[PDB]
């Protein structure tokens, strides 16, 4: 059974910094892909960023190219992403998976991560 | 060990018609909570895979599921791996969205070397199957490669426009199916063609009213269009792009042979262990499923299978078996891939109704009987439009099939990919 | 416990277009009323707009009669107004509750929503 | 005039685990640049931790190297220092001033924060 | 008999902003004073803001001299108190009387608020 446990936190002043992370366990993490996804209230899926296995390919969103850049840490299993300088238009549940956006996702979403940047 | 297609020779699969269910449905689409769910809508789907890349399309209407409007067309390829143990996925690496949404329609995608090109057609006027007498005819083919690098702006995402068309008689080209194949260096596309009915030569004497007795003899020519009075007659057919001469994008639409010639429809070319397998669907006189294997590829001279198990429902003019001439143009598309070729053995979604679209229950069938059955959903959810195909897992084939159901929590048809495998011991 | 989430907007022009908001949770949507009630400082309630709970009845007050419709979507919990075509007399709080004007309400008034229609 | 309030105190058992944090006001602390610097009686200035003005850059010395880690809290203007396994050759007073070591200084040190480690 | 009836928020993010209220009936608020006191356990009374009658003298403490800054409301008797930027130290339970910081008080604490500002 694949868990996936999401970290972070919200609750930030407009233009901070955060910092959120996502680990997880059982399927080999050496060799894999994983992606940000966010979705705010009221919207669907809008994907952030991407990474492969051997951290030759990073891709992003239009909306945040240059916002944040996704890391990899294949010797010790998680999934870190550094949100600098974000809006109000980031608040939304960010989550991890194994699929870019799509429609895709071989696994039941655990809890995610909520982002408020608002006041 | 590896994700391939139907080569060499597979493990001895079920021959057998037993009632004892050994197909175990495995959903490999699990979506997100969609609390503060709206009017959304998916439809338009797309699902190829060949040698281990897949691809999909979507068109996400707000409102109504067929009258609605455009806010994104995801389209994008990907790679299919194994989970981790024994159970394929569909791993998506690149996306592409154009735009403006609601200018693309009728997408048709194709395999290639390291790249995946989507064929989609261009109007200005909406469907283009509904508003044909304007439309101008304008054809883009998408590339996107399957495995993305840094900084290569050449190598994720070009564009080209296929301005030479080298239609006969023709009035309008337009890529209409699912996939093609591709023959060594040239790439083959699924398409239908627009003739003027005026300009029709077709004996009203060749029309299968036999036993028909409750049919005009002129329901063969009315059922070649999209109504009686119309202006256009859909014709059947493929389109060739050799990508090795690159002088000049060209298009060559070759019509379908005259042997069971119906209505325009989806049609679906594959290979299956070496041989190339045509599909085409049936929105016309003909109820029953046509299949068949090439054996000329370029005419399009197909042997169709004779099935007398496996249809598609319909509206009360033309349901479910009915094998007789009669003017209307409805159905269902349901696609089936095959799996084995010494016993032509197939295994597709097919919807189990006479004069509704629910029930989607996958179903294995050889040519005139049905093996092994199962049900992927309940016996109350709708489904309009399902996509087959089996790929093999370093031993033994697999397939994974895009059913859109009606998912119970999100009141909105959800396109749910499910991962059904063949048995090698039944009862 | 009953919680009404008002939203929406303001500071709009006079003769501007806002679509007022405000979702509920808890007592069952599918089959109860929602009124739209403003009330500006100095004076008291002031119904706007009413609806049933099948769609099938919609009031509306002498002054508000052609300005706004409001709808239903007991799909998903909320309460909208496309309020069109108001004018400085609209400068108010809105108030969503379970009563048409009377001096009734059944529920706390949450936080509401004020609309600020001048300059 | 820019005033520097240095908190936390000392007399700790040899190994353990203290929190100095200082405070200030005036000079937009947004963008600015931070650093412990600490003077045993007898001997001279001695920076142990800085840190950038967006969090990016943390250096430390060699031989607190793994002690403490700095960090910033651009929101609430202070200065913490989570100091852990400290020793008897850290007994000095702490000083927080906007230069790492150098010769340098842009206010007047206000109070300072003496921490005693020994016994 | 006076009756003070504190209100207000509390178990906030530090850094937040809060606004507490303290109601009053009997004496005429018309033409009167009234302050805000806290105190911290362990600590005594600390004034923070005070309001004249007429709202023609507004004074404050040396340590929340700019963090929030108190109103009055002579129409509706009430006394709020628009806490702004707070920090760990104003950990503590806020008072309404007729004093300005004094000994004095010339009516018994009927509830108080305690406002919790930490992690
Ligand atoms: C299949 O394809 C064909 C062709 O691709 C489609 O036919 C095309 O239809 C469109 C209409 O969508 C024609 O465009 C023009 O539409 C204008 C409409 O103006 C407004 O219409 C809406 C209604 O609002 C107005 O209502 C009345 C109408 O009189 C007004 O008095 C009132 O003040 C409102 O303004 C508005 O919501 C909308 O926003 C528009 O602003 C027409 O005015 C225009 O007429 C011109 O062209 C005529 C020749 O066609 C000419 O005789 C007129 O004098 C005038 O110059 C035109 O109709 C396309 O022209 C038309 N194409 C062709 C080739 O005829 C067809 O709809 C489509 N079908 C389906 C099912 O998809
Ligand atoms: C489109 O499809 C229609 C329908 O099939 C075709 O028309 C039919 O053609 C066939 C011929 O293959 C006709 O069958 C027979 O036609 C005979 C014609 O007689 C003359 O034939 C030639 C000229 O072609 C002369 O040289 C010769 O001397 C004859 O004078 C009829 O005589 C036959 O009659 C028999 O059947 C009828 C019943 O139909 C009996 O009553 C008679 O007693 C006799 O037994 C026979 O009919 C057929 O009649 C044609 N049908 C119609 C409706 O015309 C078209 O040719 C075809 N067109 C194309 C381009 O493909
Ligand atoms: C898509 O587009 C690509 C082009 O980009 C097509 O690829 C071409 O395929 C044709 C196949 O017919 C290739 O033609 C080849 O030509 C060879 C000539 O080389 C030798 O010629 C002499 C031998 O005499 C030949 O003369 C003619 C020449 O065409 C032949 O037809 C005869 O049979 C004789 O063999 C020698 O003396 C000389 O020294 C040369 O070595 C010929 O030998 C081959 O048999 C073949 O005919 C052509 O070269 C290909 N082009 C490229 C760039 O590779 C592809 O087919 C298209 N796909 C389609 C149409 O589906
Ligand atoms: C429909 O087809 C199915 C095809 O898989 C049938 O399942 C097979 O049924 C047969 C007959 O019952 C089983 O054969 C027996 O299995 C039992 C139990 O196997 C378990 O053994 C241990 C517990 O002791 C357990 O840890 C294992 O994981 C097994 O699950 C054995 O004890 C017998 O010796 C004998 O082998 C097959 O094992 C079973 N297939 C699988 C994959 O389990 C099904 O019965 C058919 N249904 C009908 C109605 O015909
Ligand atoms: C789904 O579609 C199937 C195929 O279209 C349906 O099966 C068909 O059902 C119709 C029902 O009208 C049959 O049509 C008639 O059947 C009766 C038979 O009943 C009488 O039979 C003899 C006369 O032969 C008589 O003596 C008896 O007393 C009965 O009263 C007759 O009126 C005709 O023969 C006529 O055929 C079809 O035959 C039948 N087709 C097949 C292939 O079975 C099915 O009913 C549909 N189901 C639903 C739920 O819609």
């Known amino acids: 059974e694949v868990q996936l446990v999401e970290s972070g936190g919200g609750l930030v002043q407009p233009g901070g910094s955060l910092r959120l992370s996502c680990?997880?366990?059982?399927?080999?993490?050496?060799?894999?892909?994983?992606?940000?996804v966010r979705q705010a209230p009221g919207k669907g899926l809008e994907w952030?960023?991407?990474?492969?296995?051997?951290?030759?390919?990073?891709?992003?969103?239009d909306s945040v190219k240059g916002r944040f850049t996704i890391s990899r840490d294949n010797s010790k299993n998680t999934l870190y992403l550094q949100m600098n300088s974000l809006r109000a238009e980031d608040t939304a549940s960010?989550?991890?998976?194994?699929?870019?956006?799509?429609?895709?996702?071989?696994?039941?979403?655990?809890?995610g991560t909520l982002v408020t940047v608002s006041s | 060990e590896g994700v391939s297609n139907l080569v060499g020779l597979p493990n001895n699969i079920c021959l057998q018609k037993t009632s004892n269910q050994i197909l175990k449905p495995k959903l490999i689409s699990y979506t997100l909570p969609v609390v503060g769910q709206s009017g959304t809508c998916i439809t338009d789907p797309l699902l190829a895979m060949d040698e281990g890349y897949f691809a999909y399309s979507h068109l996400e209407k707000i409102g109504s599921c067929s009258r609605g409007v455009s806010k994104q067309r995801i389209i994008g390829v990907g790679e299919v791996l194994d989970r981790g143990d024994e159970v394929p996925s569909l791993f998506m690496t690149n996306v592409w969205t154009p735009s403006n949404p609601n200018t693309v329609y009728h997408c048709s995608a194709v395999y290639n070397n390291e790249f995946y090109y989507v064929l989609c057609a261009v109007s200005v006027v909406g469907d283009p199957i509904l508003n044909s007498t304007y439309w101008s005819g304008s054809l883009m083919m998408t590339r996107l490669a399957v495995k993305p690098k840094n900084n290569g702006e050449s190598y994720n995402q070009h564009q080209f426009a296929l301005r030479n068309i080298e239609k006969g008689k023709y009035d309008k080209v337009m890529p209409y199916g699912p996939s093609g194949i591709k023959q060594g260096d040239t790439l083959y596309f699924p398409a239908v063609g627009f003739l003027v009915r005026t300009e029709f030569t077709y004996n009203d004497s060749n029309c299968p009213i036999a036993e028909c007795q409750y049919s005009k003899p002129e329901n063969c020519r009315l059922s070649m269009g999209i109504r009686p009075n119309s202006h256009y007659i859909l014709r059947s057919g493929l389109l060739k792009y050799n990508l090795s001469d690159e002088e000049n994008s060209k298009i060559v639409f070759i019509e379908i042979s005259d042997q069971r010639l119906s209505i325009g429809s989806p049609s679906k070319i594959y290979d299956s262990l070496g041989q190339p397998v045509f599909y085409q669907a049936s929105f016309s006189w003909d109820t029953m499923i046509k299949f068949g294997d090439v054996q000329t590829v370029n005419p399009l001279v197909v042997n169709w299978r004779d099935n007398t198990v496996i249809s598609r429902p319909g509206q009360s003019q033309c349901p479910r078996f009915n094998k007789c001439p009669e003017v209307c143009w409805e159905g269902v598309y349901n696609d089936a891939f095959l799996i084995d070729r010494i016993n032509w053995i197939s295994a597709g979604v097919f919807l189990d109704s006479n004069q509704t679209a629910e029930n989607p229950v996958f179903t294995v069938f050889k040519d005139n009987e049905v093996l092994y059955r199962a049900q992927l959903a309940s016996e109350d959810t709708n489904a309009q439009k399902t996509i087959t195909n089996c790929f093999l897992l370093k031993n033994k084939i697999w397939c994974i099939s895009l059913v859109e159901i009606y998912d119970t929590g999100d009141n909105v048809i959800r396109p749910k990919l499910f991962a059904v495998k063949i048995p090698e011991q039944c009862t | 416990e009953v919680q009404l989430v008002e939203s929406g907007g303001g500071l709009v022009q006079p003769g501007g277009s806002l679509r007022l908001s405000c979702?509920?949770?808890?007592?069952?949507?599918?089959?109860?009323?929602?009124?739209?009630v403003r009330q500006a400082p100095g004076k008291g309630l002031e119904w706007?707009?009413?609806?049933?709970?099948?769609?099938?009845?919609?009031?509306?007050?002498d002054s508000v009669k052609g300005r706004f419709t409001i709808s239903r979507d007991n799909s998903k919990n909320t309460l909208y107004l496309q309020m069109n075509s108001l004018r400085a007399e609209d400068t108010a709080s809105?108030?969503?509750?379970?009563?048409?004007?009377?001096?009734?309400?059944?529920?706390?008034?949450?936080?509401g929503t004020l609309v600020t229609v001048s300059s | 005039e820019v005033q520097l309030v240095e908190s936390g105190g000392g007399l700790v058992q040899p190994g353990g685990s203290l929190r100095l944090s200082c405070a200030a006001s005036?000079?937009?602390?947004?963008?600015?640049?931070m650093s412990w610097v600490r003077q045993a009686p007898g001997k001279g200035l001695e920076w142990v931790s800085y840190?950038?003005?967006?969090?990016?850059?943390?250096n430390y010395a060699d031989s607190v190297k793994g002690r403490f880690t700095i960090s910033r809290d651009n929101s609430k203007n202070t200065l913490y220092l989570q100091m852990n396994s400290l020793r008897a050759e850290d007994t000095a007073s702490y000083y927080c001033?906007?230069?790492?070591?150098?010769?340098?200084?842009?206010?007047?040190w206000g109070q300072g924060t003496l921490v005693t480690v020994s016994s | 008999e006076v009756q003070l009836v504190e209100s207000g928020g509390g178990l906030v993010q530090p850094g937040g902003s809060l606004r507490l209220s303290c109601?009053?009936?009997?004496?005429?608020?018309?033409?009167?004073?009234?302050?805000?006191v806290r105190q911290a356990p362990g600590k005594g009374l600390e004034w923070?803001?005070?309001?004249?009658?007429?709202?023609?003298?507004?004074?404050?403490?040396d340590s929340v001299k700019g963090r929030f800054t108190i109103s009055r409301d002579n129409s509706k008797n009430t006394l709020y108190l628009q806490m702004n930027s707070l920090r760990a130290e104003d950990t503590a339970s806020?008072?309404?009387?007729?004093?300005?910081?004094?000994?004095?008080?010339?009516?018994?604490?009927?509830?108080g608020t305690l406002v919790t500002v930490s992690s």
């Open positions: 001033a906007r230069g790492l070591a150098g010769v340098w200084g842009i206010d007047v």
């Open positions: 005036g000079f937009t602390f947004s963008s600015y640049a």
């Open positions: 840190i950038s003005s967006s969090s990016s850059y943390t």
